[PDB]
Amino acid sequence: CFTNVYADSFVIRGDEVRQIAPGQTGKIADYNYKLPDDFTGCVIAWNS
Amino acid sequence: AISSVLNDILSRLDKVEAEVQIDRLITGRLQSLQTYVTQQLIRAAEIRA
What we know:
Chain A: This is Spike protein S1. The structure is cut from a larger assembly and holds 2 copies of chain A. With about 50 residues, chain A is an all-alpha fold.
């Protein structure tokens, strides 16, 4: 169980998924979506 | 670890990787003081006697 929960929703290139993971670098990891150094949570991605 | 200097880690690696090097340096430097202080505690038991 969880204290609070959120679903952050957006679309990217299929290669940029590696950048979403916490502690990365590349424009997606740096200028638009940064996950914190203790990111407790999951990344869910699929070609749409 | 990659260096004996803290900034020669940080100015090269990034946050999650410096955290891996620096934990190697902390583990061993903390072990160095637990050793020094243990030596001095045994050596204190001599200078007391």
